Amino acid sequence: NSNICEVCNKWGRLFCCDTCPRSFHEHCHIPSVEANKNPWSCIFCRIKTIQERCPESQSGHQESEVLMRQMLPEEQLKCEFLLLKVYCDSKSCFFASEPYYNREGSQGPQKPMWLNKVKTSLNEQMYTRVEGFVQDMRLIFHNHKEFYREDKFTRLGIQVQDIFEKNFRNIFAIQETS
Numbered sequence: 001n002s003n004i005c006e007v008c009n010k011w012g013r014l015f016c017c018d019t020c021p022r023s024f025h026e027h028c029h030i031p032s033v034e035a036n037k038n039p040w041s042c043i044f045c046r047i048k049t050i051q052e053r054c055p056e057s058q059s060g061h062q063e064s065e066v067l068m069r070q071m072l073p074e075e076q077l078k079c080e081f082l083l084l085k086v087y088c089d090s091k092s093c094f095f096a097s098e099p100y101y102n103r104e105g106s107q108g109p110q111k112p113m114w115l116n117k118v119k120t121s122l123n124e125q126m127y128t129r130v131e132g133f134v135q136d137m138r139l140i141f142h143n144h145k146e147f148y149r150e151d152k153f154t155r156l157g158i159q160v161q162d163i164f165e166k167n168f169r170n171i172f173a174i175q176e177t178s
């Protein structure tokens with residue numbers, strides 16, 4: 001197995017996947033690495049299994065249909081994986097914890113949002129449809145763009161949103177378009 005965490009790329013107390021060579025810190029994996037279970041399969045492996053069991057799940061889908069799906073076990077897992085893919089980017093550090101807003105010439109957002117809040121919301125089964133998760137994720141980046149206005153720091157929001165959107169289209173097999 002790898003000797004660094006797949007998500008944060010650091011060594012430490014790592015849990016090893018039994019079906020692929022990835023490793024994880026306990027709370028870097030989403031969901032948090034399960035207490036017992038030998039063998040243990042990571043989320044990359046679990047997602048791969050879903051695909052392999054239902055190859056047709058990779059045919060193109062309309063975003064509007066994906067968003068109305070109820071958060072049954074497979075959709076819950078797919079949102080956890082998508083969240084994890086965003087944490088895999090080092091730029092996620094800017095969006096992880098609760099923000100605060102005190103900049104001359106801007107006003108903070110009406111509804112602040114951050115990754116760790118989305119992570120807690122998923123853990124607590126607070127989303128009933130995929131739309132709830134996706135709306136909160138997109139709101140993270142929208143709030144950032146609006147607050148930072150013309151500061152070049154706005155680009156971090158564009159960058160991490162692009163990671164989000166690419167992974168959303170991949171995980172939920174959104175129909176490719178120009």
Ligand SMILES: [Zn+2]
Nearest residue numbers: 005008025028
């Ligand atoms: Zn880690």
Ligand SMILES: [Zn+2]
Nearest residue numbers: 017020042045
């Ligand atoms: Zn694995």
Ligand SMILES: [Zn+2]
Nearest residue numbers: 053054055056
């Ligand atoms: Zn099938």
